[PDB]
Amino acid sequence: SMSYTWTGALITPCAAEESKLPINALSNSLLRHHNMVYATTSRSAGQRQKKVTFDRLQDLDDHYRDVLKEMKAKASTVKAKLLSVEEACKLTPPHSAKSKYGYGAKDVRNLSSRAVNHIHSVWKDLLEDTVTPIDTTIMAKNEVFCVQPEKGGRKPARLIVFPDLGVRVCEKMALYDVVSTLPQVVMGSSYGFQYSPGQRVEFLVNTWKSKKNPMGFSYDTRCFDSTVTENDIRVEESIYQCCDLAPEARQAIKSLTERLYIGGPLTNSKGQNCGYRRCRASGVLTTSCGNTLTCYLKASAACRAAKLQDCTMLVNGDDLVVICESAGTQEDAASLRVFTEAMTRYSAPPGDPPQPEYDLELITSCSSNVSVAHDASGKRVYYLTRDPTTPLARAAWETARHTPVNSWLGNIIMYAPTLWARMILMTHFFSILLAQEQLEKALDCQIYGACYSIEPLDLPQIIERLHGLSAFSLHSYSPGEINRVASCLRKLGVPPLRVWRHRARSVRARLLSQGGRAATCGKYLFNWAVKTKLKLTPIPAASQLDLSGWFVAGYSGGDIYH
Numbered sequence: 001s002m003s004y005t006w007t008g009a010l011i012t013p014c015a016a017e018e019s020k021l022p023i024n025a026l027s028n029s030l031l032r033h034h035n036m037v038y039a040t041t042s043r044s045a046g047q048r049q050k051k052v053t054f055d056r057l058q059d060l061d062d063h064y065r066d067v068l069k070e071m072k073a074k075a076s077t078v079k080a081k082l083l084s085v086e087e088a089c090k091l092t093p094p095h096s097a098k099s100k101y102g103y104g105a106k107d108v109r110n111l112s113s114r115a116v117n118h119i120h121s122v123w124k125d126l127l128e129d130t131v132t133p134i135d136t137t138i139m140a141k142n143e144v145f146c147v148q149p150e151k152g153g154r155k156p157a158r159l160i161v162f163p164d165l166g167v168r169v170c171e172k173m174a175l176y177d178v179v180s181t182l183p184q185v186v187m188g189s190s191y192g193f194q195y196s197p198g199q200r201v202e203f204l205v206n207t208w209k210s211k212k213n214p215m216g217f218s219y220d221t222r223c224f225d226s227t228v229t230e231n232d233i234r235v236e237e238s239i240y241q242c243c244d245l246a247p248e249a250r251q252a253i254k255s256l257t258e259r260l261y262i263g264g265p266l267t268n269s270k271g272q273n274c275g276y277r278r279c280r281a282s283g284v285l286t287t288s289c290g291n292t293l294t295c296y297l298k299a300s301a302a303c304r305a306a307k308l309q310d311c312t313m314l315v316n317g318d319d320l321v322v323i324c325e326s327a328g329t330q331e332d333a334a335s336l337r338v339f340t341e342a343m344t345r346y347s348a349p350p351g352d353p354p355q356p357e358y359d360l361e362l363i364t365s366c367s368s369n370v371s372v373a374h375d376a377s378g379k380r381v382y383y384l385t386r387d388p389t390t391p392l393a394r395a396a397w398e399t400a401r402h403t404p405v406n407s408w409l410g411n412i413i414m415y416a417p418t419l420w421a422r423m424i425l426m427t428h429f430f431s432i433l434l435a436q437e438q439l440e441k442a443l444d445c446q447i448y449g450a451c452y453s454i455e456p457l458d459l460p461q462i463i464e465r466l467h468g469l470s471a472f473s474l475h476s477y478s479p480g481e482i483n484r485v486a487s488c489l490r491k492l493g494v495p496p497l498r499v500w501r502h503r504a505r506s507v508r509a510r511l512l513s514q515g516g517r518a519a520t521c522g523k524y525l526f527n528w529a530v531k532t533k534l535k536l537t538p539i540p541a542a543s544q545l546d547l548s549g550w551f552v553a554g555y556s557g558g559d560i561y562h
């Protein structure tokens with residue numbers, strides 16, 4: 001069936017959309033080639049519509065059925081519970097889209113009577129009606145990128161499809177516990193969202209080392225959400241139903257599947273019918289879990305079809321990497337074509353075709369790779385990094401323009417051991433926070449799709465707890481990593497190391513001069529910049545720090561605030 005059908009009504013904005021990075025003295029000090037940075041807007045929604053609209057063909061074989069049986073068996077060991085209306089209300093982000101029924105996210109978090117009474121009504125109706133399609137809104141994502149002259153053209157806006165606020169609270173009630181618990185039980189060590197960046201590195205390295213002649217590849221499904229069929233969504237539901245659930249949870253999950261997850265009508269911001277969806281909704285609670293399970297199922301079965309030798313998967317939504325034993329270069333290339341043939345058969349045809357990699361460092365998964373540096377003792381050590389272009393482009397935008405969720409703070413947290421986050425992101429943003437006297441202001445950021453309020457001054461103990469003390473003393477980064485960063489700096493017109501070190505020394509001295517938590521930021525975050533390194537010792541606040549709840553599950557599109 002077609003992933004979408006369209007009426008002709010436009011995907012509309014409801015406010016101004018800015019497409020060009022503004023000229024701003026603060027962002028210019030970070031990167032001067034502002035014309036390389038752009039944001040997606042509703043003006044390219046039609047381009048995206050064309051790309052995501054296609055007919056899906058799917059055939060299922062024994063390998064698929066076998067894997068599915070195994071998955072269901074593990075799922076049958078899971079017990080999940082309903083959230084109360086209050087517990088669900090409290091998971092709603094403060095800036096979550098307001099209801100069309102006369103209330104907003106503040107009213108939900110405040111447990112206002114209008115909000116809470118409406119949520120109750122929505123739930124009752126889910127129980128009473130398991131057929132009528134639930135309305136969704138479709139909007140164009142506004143996201144920031146750098147131009148890629150080599151790829152030929154710019155990225156069009158992604159589309160987000162989401163039901164009303166009251167429905168979203170109901171999804172939490174029925175499914176938050178399931179989507180939080182089930183993926184790891186079903187997929188075990190292959191479920192990527194259980195890992196911090198350090199733990200993902202450890203898994204990838206240990207997995208690579210476990211093969212005699214390792215080969216790895218990432219598999220890029222073309223528009224994954226669009227490839228998800230009604231069968232797939234019903235298969236997902238059948239896995240959820242393997243859990244030990246309360247009778248009302250079972251009914252709510254069935255109703256949500258029939259009326260929301262399988263498909264339904266699409267309404268623009270102006271209330272006009274834009275069309276109909278028969279694929280994954282990008283903005284529901286089950287998007288991440290659903291995609292992860294389905295990607296895992298198809299890939300696992302495809303591994304068996306291609307006769308890949310000792311294949312280990314790492315899956316995060318639609319993002320997939322496979323590490324296995326090489327059978328030789330020609331044999332590996334052929335195997336990857338069979339794997340791709342099988343994925344296609346299962347309705348996950350490829351974007352870029354997979355290519356075998358024999359150096360773990362060159363495998364990009366979840367837009368990131370393993371790299372090497374040295375700690376203070378000189379020990380060669382592994383850490384997670386990525387190409388810094390998108391992080392820097394977004395940091396420039398977020399410097400010039402106030403944004404709901406910043407990405408720069410999440411990037412500092414996740415990529416704290418990297419040379420680019422330390423050299424550029426920490427230096428830039430602490431300089432800004434100093435100037436504005438906003439070091440003390442908590443900021444919203446995202447980790448694995450979930451929103452968190454984080455205090456910049458707590459960054460030293462967060463980083464220690466997450467990455468270890470070595471994060472403040474890594475050095476001797478790989479030539480490839482250094483070169484990748486230097487290329488990006490030239491491309492974006494970012495200042496060189498000499499300038500960031502001078503900036504960092506000044507930021508550091510100011511921080512130290514202020515005392516308290518500010519001084520601890522100066523000492524630990526910027527120790528790299530000074531000639532005479534201080535001895536960094538364990539931060540007491542770090543040993544009372546529980547960050548495990550940050551790396552439980554993915555929630556991208558799922559409207560979660562922790």
Ligand SMILES: CCc1cc(CC[C@]2(C3CCCC3)CC(O)=C(Cc3nc4nc(C)cc(C)n4n3)C(=O)O2)cc(CC)n1
Nearest residue numbers: 375376418419422423473474475476477482485486497528
């Ligand atoms: C693309 C810009 C660039 C960056 C770098 C990395 C420089 C830098 C990073 C910048 C941020 C965090 C650290 C700074 C920096 O000063 C060093 C040098 C260093 N720091 C140490 N610390 C200890 C304990 C022990 C040793 C031997 N070193 N050696 C580094 O390796 O990395 C190197 C180069 C090539 C010179 N170019």
